[PDB]
Write an enzyme that holds these catalytic residues in place. Structure first.
Site, PDB file in Angstrom:
ATOM      1  N   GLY A 197       0.788  -1.281   0.000  1.00 28.82           N
ATOM      2  CA  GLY A 197       0.000   0.000   0.000  1.00 28.82           C
ATOM      3  C   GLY A 197       0.794   1.291   0.000  1.00 28.82           C
ATOM      4  N   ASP A 212       9.381 -11.060   7.213  1.00 28.68           N
ATOM      5  CA  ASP A 212       8.583  -9.982   6.657  1.00 28.68           C
ATOM      6  C   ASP A 212       7.646 -10.472   5.513  1.00 28.68           C
ATOM      7  OD1 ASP A 212       7.642  -7.299   6.798  1.00 28.68           O
ATOM      8  OD2 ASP A 212       9.381  -6.404   5.973  1.00 28.68           O
ATOM      9  N   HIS A 228      14.620  -5.618  11.447  1.00 23.57           N
ATOM     10  CA  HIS A 228      15.289  -5.084  10.266  1.00 23.57           C
ATOM     11  C   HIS A 228      16.713  -4.642  10.576  1.00 23.57           C
ATOM     12  CE1 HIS A 228      11.223  -5.289   8.879  1.00 23.57           C
ATOM     13  NE2 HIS A 228      10.868  -4.080   9.252  1.00 23.57           N
TER      14      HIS A 228
HETATM   15 ZN   LIG Z   1       9.069  -3.075   8.912  1.00 23.38          ZN
HETATM   16 ZN   LIG Z   2       6.978  -5.648   8.219  1.00 24.99          ZN
END
Ligand SMILES: [Zn+2]
Ligand SMILES: [Zn+2]
Ligand SMILES: [Zn+2]
Ligand SMILES: [Zn+2]
Lengths: 374, 374
Positions: free
Chosen positions: A74, A288, A229
């Site tokens: 998005g 992810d 991350h």
């Molecule tokens: Zn993230």
């Molecule tokens: Zn994520």
């Protein structure tokens, strides 16, 4: 049938046990013992299925702490909303437990969406949990507060993925962050659940400052703060390595091979952590997926083994390390009393068999169960 | 240990099966088979406990659909608020699954109290669910609507105990009632849970008129409307028996033996139902514990068997008939695949052993597990 005897498996629990036989009873691991075969008498009235694995590797199922189970995207327009991730996309990648979250788009997606999909995955046989709150501040929740969400919605384990040091973040203040951390921490005490805040890190030069200050200035335990991350850029990885000394778990992202951009591939970051003698039990790996695909978890594992790291060095990053930070007391180990979530791997570490809660989802490299709309 | 072999049990499932041996595997019933004379060799490496019962009666655990787990009372001043009901008050009465609710006092007590206590009892090893909404309108809920409490709070199965024909009611309208019923019914579809409205009946002469009207005038299935306390006066019991022909389950209250006096003792009401050839699968019995003690369920059972009714006739009213209406697909029956929630009784029908989710809470007349603060 309800009892399954897995004979002649080379168990990485994740720690290596050698060749064993394992009795599964329903959704639990009931026994692990030195391998026999023809000398065991099984009563005829008991429904027992016996499988011989010829010494194949057996590992716990992967626990993926970071997946956009509803689909993410998005950020490049409304047509970029990813559809919900199918059951087999998890189970075929060796994921037997998933923790879902919202990411940048917590404007058009809701926690009701997220939690609905957790129940749907649970109905299809996967273990599933989620993070409340999302990326932005004010938080997106079902009940109006993180505290109440974590307290009263059983699958909600903490707040995530809350953004810091990213151009898409809410520019959260130190005071906002420590208040959110207090909420999840206390809700974890009330519930016995993880009680963590899982932070999305961006490429901002402020890096982990907010978390560093929280741990230095406040009484909040370091384990409450769980940045992900952390391999996305090199200075951030370096700071994340230092943060280990405080007692945080840090989470690497298994980027598609050749994609780690100006940071480290996850297999390289893990190699670095090993060499540096960092507290490896505090390091985890997530996909992810939906945001990513859960199969990068195994790809990263194989890339690590290819460098000469041992399975027992890396495998905790996908299993027991995750279950420790998330307080999943019954996951992440091949041990008596723990859930029967397990993988069989062949000699090149392809996942050939997947069991979740004592039910086969993949067997002899064939799909046994797929999602309702797959 | 995680496998328990119950040998030489006379099973009422509730249906009479004769003498059997039963294998429990973790929280589930794994096998049920004919009791032979030679002891069978169990592999020594498997953790199996074997227990011989000498032909004793074995039944499913009782499912009590109406208990004030937080305590009820409050109707004669603030000093009348009953304290929370201890774990053993359920287990030692044979109750292995409880459904909690609020009653007249939904002003000082909250759904947060109720659901907290549900999770508490689950942590102590009881199965536990609750009704949201309570007694009055507007409803007491966590999320602000029944529909959203039933959809997102796993343990919440419907609305209850919502008062009609009672001086303490909210004087609900037909339009109010059918909208509530719509909420719970649809939420049942979304979730697979009971999706019922459990009604507190008082002694008002209007009796079941609102229910009768809902069924006659609307498309709502009769099973949605579940009146309780139907034995509390004789005209109500007569009207509740007529409602069986429409397809509703009706719930009797196991009043303490002294005390049903304008109405019928539960054992007398049951005897009348059997005599009258009513649909016995549609009649249940609950304790109103806390409001009331769960040991009246056993007392009623013994009082009906003393009239000469059979155990297989009456036992469904505490077990399978409850599971059927509340959509507890894994409870209420001694059958392979169902939950290992089991009672052993002596020949006087006194409960000597209680197993919940495969764990003994009472064994050989001794307490094995008590509540945290009992
Ligand atoms: Zn993230
Ligand atoms: Zn994520
Ligand atoms: Zn009542
Ligand atoms: Zn009541």
């Amino acid at each position: 049938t309800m009892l399954i005897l897995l004979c002649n498996v080379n168990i990485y629990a994740p720690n290596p046990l050698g060749i064993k036989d394992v009795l599964i009873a329903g959704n639990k691991i009931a026994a692990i013992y030195d391998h026999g075969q023809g000398e065991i008498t099984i009563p005829k009235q008991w429904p027992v299925k016996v499988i011989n694995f010829d010494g194949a590797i057996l590992t716990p199922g992967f626990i993926d702490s970071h997946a956009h189970i509803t689909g993410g995207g998005g950020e490049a327009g409304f047509a970029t909303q990813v559809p919900p991730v199918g059951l087999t996309e998890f189970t075929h990648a060796g994921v037997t437990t998933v923790v879902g979250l919202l990411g940048t788009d917590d404007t058009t997606r809701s926690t009701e969406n997220l939690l609905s999909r957790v129940y749907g995955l649970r109905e299809e046989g996967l273990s599933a949990y989620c993070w409340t709150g999302g990326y932005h501040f004010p938080l997106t929740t079902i009940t109006g507060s993180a505290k109440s969400d974590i307290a009263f919605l059983e699958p909600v384990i903490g707040i995530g993925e809350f953004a810091i040091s990213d151009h898409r973040s809410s520019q959260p203040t130190f005071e906002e962050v420590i208040r959110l951390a207090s909420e999840t921490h206390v809700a974890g005490l009330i519930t016995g659940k993880a009680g963590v805040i899982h932070f999305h890190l961006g490429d901002g030069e402020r890096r982990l400052e907010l978390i560093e200050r929280a741990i230095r200035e406040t009484e909040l335990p370091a384990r409450v703060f769980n940045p992900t991350h952390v391999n996305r850029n090199k200075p951030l990885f370096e700071d994340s390595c230092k943060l280990l000394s405080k007692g945080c778990h840090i989470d690497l992202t298994a980027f598609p091979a050749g994609t780690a951009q100006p940071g480290w591939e996850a297999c390289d970051a893990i190699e670095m952590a090993v060499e540096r003698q960092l507290p490896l039990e505090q390091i985890t790996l997530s996909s992810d997926g939906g945001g990513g695909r859960a199969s990068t978890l195994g790809e990263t594992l194989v890339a690590t083994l290819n460098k000469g790291l041992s399975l027992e060095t890396v495998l905790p990053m996908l299993t027991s390390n995750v279950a420790n930070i998330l307080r999943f007391k019954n996951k992440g180990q091949i041990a008596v009393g723990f859930d029967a979530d397990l993988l069989v791997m062949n000699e090149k570490y392809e996942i050939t068999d997947v069991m979740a809660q004592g039910v086969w989802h993949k067997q002899n490299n064939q799909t046994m169960i797929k999602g309702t709309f797959e």
